[PDB]
Each structure stands twice: as C-alpha cells, then as structure tokens.
C-alpha cells in the first residue's frame, strides 16, 4: 500500500540499532 510497507523497510534498519 505505502505506510504498511514503510514499516517493512525501516524495521530492517533499527533491527540492529535496537536494544529493548
């Protein structure tokens, strides 16, 4: 759609910059 997939790419970035 748009945003529903915008959280499928950024969720691959902070996936390593995530702690908790």
What are the CA-CA distances from residue 10 to residues 1, 2, 19, 20 (Å)?
15, 13, 15, 16
Three-state secondary structure of the chain: CCHHHHHHHHHHCHHHHCCC
Number of other CB atoms surrounding residue 13 within 10 Å: 9
What are the CA-CA distances from residue 16 to residues 1, 2, 3, 4 (Å)?
25, 23, 21, 21
Structure tokens at 19: 């702690």
Method: NMR
The C-alpha atoms of residue 11 and residue 6 are separated, in whole angstroms, by 8
Phi-psi region of 18 (alpha: psi -120 to 50; beta: other; left: phi over 0): beta
């Amino acid at each position: 759609h748009g945003l529903a997939s915008t959280l499928t790419r950024w969720a691959h970035y902070n996936a390593l910059i995530r702690a908790f």
